[PDB]
Ligand SMILES: *C(=O)C[C@@H]1O[C@@H](C)[C@@H](O)[C@@H](O)[C@@H]1O
Ligand SMILES: *C(=O)C[C@@H]1O[C@@H](C)[C@@H](O)[C@@H](O)[C@@H]1O
């Protein structure tokens with residue numbers, strides 16, 4: 480009955496994103512070399528995985544948030560957190 | 569309760585593999601730029617983790633399926649999924 | 658229930674670190690091309706995440722060990738496992 484985390488990172492500084500599902504909410508903590516700051520991501524889910532890739536200098540994050548049998552993909556591409564095409568059927 | 573996912577990406581397109589443990593079984597959803605489709609991965613498990621890595625253009629995936637204390641490793645290196653040499657002791 | 662794992666890789670060889678939470682304790686199993694051994698990492702946690710990044714040849718690993726609402730970051734920077742600056746939202 481502990482919280483459940485997921486992490487990703489990029490570059491050599493580095494930048495780190497740590498997502499934490501606690502009591503059906505997933506929050507984000509962010510490192511870009513100067514301290515941890517609470518991030519923009521806030522979405523429901525008891526379980527969370529993450530991946531990320533660079534395109535040049537631009538990070539792209541995909542956060543998979545599952546409640547029950549329902550996994551929701553949240554997409555960061557530098558313009559906010561939008562919902563992805565991800566489904567499972 | 570909730571399903572438990574694990575993701576990895578690679579490239580800049582990118583390619584994304586999203587593994588989902590649901591009711592004791594792990595399956596795989598795949599993105600390579602033109603839509604999600606169900607992958608060939610299909611092995612038992614109540615927990616999943618994943619890592620990948622490129623040797624040039626070739627992708628290499630490692631899936632750590634766990635059921636109780638037993639964590640099996642599944643290897644994709646181009647010609648299908650093979651059980652890997654991982655153990656815990 | 659079932660044990661829970663996290664994994665990261667680096668290089669072309671590659672090197673793999675598979676972390677495993679089992680009744681409170683998180684242990685590590687390491688691959689560097691010549692088989693699986695047991696790594697130095699040993700910290701308490703009911704759930705673990707991990708990420709890693711290269712800086713030239715030097716690997717850097719962050720392991721997020723959670724127990725209850727409390728998540729602890731462990732840092733590999735080629736000189737051991739030190740406690741990280743991460744705190745929660
Ligand atoms: C500023 O806070 C932006 C920031 O970093 C983004 C990549 C993403 O993690 C966002 O949620 C976060 O708040
Ligand atoms: C829309 O712009 C595509 C988008 O990003 C992909 C990498 C994939 O995550 C897809 O689910 C998402 O909608």
Ligand SMILES: *C(=O)C[C@@H]1O[C@@H](C)[C@@H](O)[C@@H](O)[C@@H]1O
Nearest residue numbers: 674685687695696697698733
């Ligand atoms: C030698 O044992 C070092 C080894 O690999 C490190 C990168 C880190 O994973 C450490 O815990 C492990 O023991």
Ligand SMILES: *C(=O)C[C@@H]1O[C@@H](C)[C@@H](O)[C@@H](O)[C@@H]1O
Nearest residue numbers: 493510719730732741742743
């Ligand atoms: C140095 O930056 C401190 C250190 O490394 C960061 C990337 C992050 O993991 C931080 O919590 C850790 O203390």
